[PDB]
Design a protein around this ligand. Sequence first.
Ligand SMILES: [Mg+2]
Lengths: 201, 349, 116, 238
Amino acid sequence: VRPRLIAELARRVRALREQLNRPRDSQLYAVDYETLTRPFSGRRLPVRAWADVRRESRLLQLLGRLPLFGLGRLVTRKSWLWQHDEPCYWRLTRVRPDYTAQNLDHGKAWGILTFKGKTESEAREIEHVMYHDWRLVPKHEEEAFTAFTASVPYPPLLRAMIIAERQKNGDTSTEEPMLNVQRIRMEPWDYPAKQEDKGRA
Amino acid sequence: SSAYVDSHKWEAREKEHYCLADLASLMDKTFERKLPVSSLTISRLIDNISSREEIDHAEYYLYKFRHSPNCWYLRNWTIHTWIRQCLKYDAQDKALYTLVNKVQYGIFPDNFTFNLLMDSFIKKENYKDALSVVFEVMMQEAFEVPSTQLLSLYVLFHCLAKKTDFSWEEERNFGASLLLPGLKQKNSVGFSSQLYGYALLGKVELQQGLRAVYHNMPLIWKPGYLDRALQVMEKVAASPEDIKLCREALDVLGAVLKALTKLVEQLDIEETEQSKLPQYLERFKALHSKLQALKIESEGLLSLTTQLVKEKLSTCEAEDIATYEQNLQQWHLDLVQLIQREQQQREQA
Amino acid sequence: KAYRGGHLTIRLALGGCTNRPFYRIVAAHNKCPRDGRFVEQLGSYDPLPNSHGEKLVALNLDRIRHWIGCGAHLSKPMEKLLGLAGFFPLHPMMITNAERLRRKRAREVLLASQKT
Amino acid sequence: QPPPKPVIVDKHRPVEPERRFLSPEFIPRRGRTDPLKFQIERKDMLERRKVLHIPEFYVGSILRVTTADPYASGKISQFLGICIQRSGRGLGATFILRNVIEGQGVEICFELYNPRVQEIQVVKLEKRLDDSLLYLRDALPEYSTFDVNMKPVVQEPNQKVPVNELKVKMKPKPWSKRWERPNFNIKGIRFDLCLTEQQMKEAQKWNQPWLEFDMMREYDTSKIEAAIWKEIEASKRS
Ligand SMILES: [Mg+2]
């Protein structure tokens, strides 16, 4: 068998060069409000976020106006609080801005979160940081805002099949078959995801 | 308060006495190789600075630090080294430019340091300077401190001494700044200033919409500023002492002048403020009549009442000084560890 | 042909000459072509009526359940047919289509009653 | 939103005070003529110097030059190169530059008083053991290959001349100038690999010790350079 070395060489070189000089998060997140197109991509924004990007600012842009980017300060998911009346927030623990930015308006930061008062005992990562859908809640009116408080039949053919099965088995079991639905935790769309799972240009 | 403004400990405590030129060369090489650099370099530099050109060198070295691989550290003691090194050599326009464009600098002075700064500003007796600076304090949102009385004095004096009729940026800034100083829940001065700030914010809304109310400014998004003002007035009438001034006259003037004859952020079912104006004026006159039926001398000058605050101001300045010495002790404690840490690299080498 | 990532998918394969489509429910990978290779042929479906007028469709219940337990995603038409069969829940988009058709029929009947 | 700014200071009492440095082109040649020629040409080049800065340099230094050329993209010509030599006196004095690009080793002769040049810049300031480095044509290209976009290596504002003590490998024997001879007094090259003891010892037969022992051909300069400095300072004050 004949080996091949230039393939591995080019692979290693490309990996090193891209991990060295990857595009900056601030650079590839920057948006021009005149045309609404991200540089380095030439792609247009969605109609639902057009106005949000035109008007509202970004997470780090908001957090740049207070020391240390406000450790523990109230930042709430505008989308969550417009989709549901219940309060939802982010217990931001760690922060790291991108220094290449002039206004320091981009970076990575996260901690514990809560959804409908459901606290999580793990400081996991935020989702959709670069959106212009971030609203800062001051420390006044804080506790008032943070205040917070069977089974289904089987399908007809499936239950008929189980009926025939247990009839051949011999048991009567006139009870209608059922499954647990409270165990099935149907999760709303807005439940966050893991950033590291999704890649990056 | 000369004793409050003076502090010989800071200027005669922990001077590095390193060569400004050598520190500058080290910083330049480190920012050439663009690897992260601790704040020890800039701190020692600033502590050694004794010249105008050298304060400028530190200024754009702070530029370079903001643009350096590390920015979150943001050491208040280094910030105050810089502030003292600037304000002892009296770079007024420079300090003003920094405090206005802090987004490029990233300076965030704490209560006592800012109080010393504003006391020097008093000593030099400039008004628009202090006005822009207290606007930047409003931006900072740091008002639960002994400097709240100084902020209150400044705003209560400047809102009267301004005499500028139509300016939307300035008037919105006044309306937004007149809230946070009064949040310490003290007296008529406090909650009536909150009321007048609600009124000014509602006026800015009615004249230029709710967008600017929050776009470049952290505010609450409820449009009913006039409704909240009416709530405040009626709850005050229901419930102490209420020393009032004729700013209610300006409130009435604004209400009546607005009663006189694109993105849709308002909700459809709910009413629009343009259509709420009539019942707003109705309930405003009703609450006015109720308050006059119920304190309404309307003679006590608001800036004069801040002179009575000087008593408890001079009381709380003691606790402020004490907290400042506590901060100094904590800094001298945690900072000495960082010098032996820098020696750890040389020991490893 | 080892496809990176991807996932098995029970979906419809097309057969028959033009103007005579004949679908076949069959398990295959997400990356395979329309008539590409498969794993196990599961069932068939004729969208045309026979001499009796009814339309033909076949399901392999045990094997389909085994494939689903092993892990296989479903395509909207095949799970629509399953929900119509009854082994599977009914389709909400099917409910909406039915409701829309009934709304439009009522509207047209109302317009006809107005015209007459 | 002004940009940042660079500075470099250095205040060491024994190290920083480097007193004076003269250009090799103000000085005249041993030849005989009226000093009036020299002094008028000198004041001319000095009243041009008032415009043009000439960040001083040496042989083995790297210069980036921008000049106003009629036939070029934007009518400007930019060139980076190593200083091989500085030759000539008066206004017509020139310096050579060299660089390897696209496998071709190119060299230019830039005159430092023609208005056609717009600006010159010292990317690096160092000094080599050899007075003239025109043997880099026979040296390997990898010693001469330099980047056009390499940034300026800013030197401290007042320090001694950095002298890189190194050697150079060369292309094999078929050389154009026969550098192995002792007439040239060169040391950057490496005889130990470029030739043998036999060849070196056979080339040092042309050696004559007496050239340096002589004292009538040597050229004293102290008074001349002193008068030159004095006239330069007078022109500066004026
Ligand atoms: Mg030749």
